[PDB]
Design a protein around this ligand. Structure first.
Ligand SMILES: [Zn+2]
Length: 270
């Protein structure tokens, strides 16, 4: 009840004077069992923003497992392929990057060109969506490339998920049989090394805890985070938080998410 109070308070603060569709969504799952521990608007849609990049690399790893792709395959590209927010890819115009390096860049640094390059390797947004639907997530959809997929037009379902869908999908990728044990470990390792989510859940994380996460930010107030975390050096729950529609600035939206994190940590229970 305490984390749920905070999530409602967060939404009230962020949306009161938005003058457009505005919401917060949250779900917490038991990692081992998949049991839904608590939720707030679990079945409402939100823009994924860069949180999709985990699902993208899941699709890539599936192809690697199937012998259709190699972690070490090198991809070259041109300066004209670089889109907004390409901190890693723009440093490798000469050398290109391997598929492994691209996934590290997409997940750990939120590199947009790396995501587009990876989308190409699997056949585009439609094939990411196909991969998701084929593993039983018929809600999540990627429709556009970077950066247009961050547009966050109110109530547009393009490039959206639901908290429950994302959380359930994340659980299947990280601990189910969709990927080999080696690939599922690679996926969580990239998330563990996330470099660009400090002001969100990581800001509330106690010493000794494990976190593997991926953040997102888009237009029209959109912000979110997906995570696997737990005490004692191992993840034991999945957390997904999304918001869209607020007119509040970045730092304020960050603070509200970090506050939800602090609550869910304080009130973790056994
Ligand atoms: Zn479907």
């Amino acid at each position: 009840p305490e984390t749920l109070v905070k999530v409602k308070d967060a939404e009230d603060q962020l949306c009161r004077t938005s003058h457009r569709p505005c919401r917060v969504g949250y779900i917490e799952l038991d990692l081992n069992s998949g049991k839904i521990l608590e939720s707030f608007r679990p079945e409402e849609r939100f823009p994924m923003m860069s949180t999709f990049k985990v699902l993208l690399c899941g699709a890539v790893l599936s192809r690697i497992d199937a012998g259709q792709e190699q972690l070490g395959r090198r991809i070259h590209y041109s300066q004209n392929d670089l889109v907004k927010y390409s901190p890693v890819t723009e440093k490798h115009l000469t050398d290109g990057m391997t598929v492994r390096e691209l996934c590290s860049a997409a997940i750990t640094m939120s590199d947009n060109t790396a995501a587009n390059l990876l989308l190409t390797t699997i056949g585009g947004p439609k094939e990411l969506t196909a991969f998701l639907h084929n593993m039983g997530d018929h809600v999540t959809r990627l429709d556009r490339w970077e950066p247009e997929l961050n547009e966050a037009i109110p109530n547009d379902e393009r490039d959206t998920t639901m908290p429950v869908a994302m959380a359930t999908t994340l659980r299947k990728l990280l601990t189910g049989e969709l990927l080999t044990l080696a690939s599922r470990q690679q996926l969580i390792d990239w998330m563990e090394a996330d470099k660009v989510a400090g002001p969100l859940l990581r800001s509330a994380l106690p010493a000794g805890w494990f976190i593997a996460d991926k953040s997102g930010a888009g237009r029209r107030g959109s912000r979110g985070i997906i995570a696997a975390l737990g005490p004692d050096g191992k993840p034991s729950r999945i957390v997904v938080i999304y918001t869209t529609g607020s007119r509040k600035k970045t730092d304020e939206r960050n603070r509200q998410i970090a506050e939800i994190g602090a609550s869910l940590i304080k009130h973790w229970g056994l």
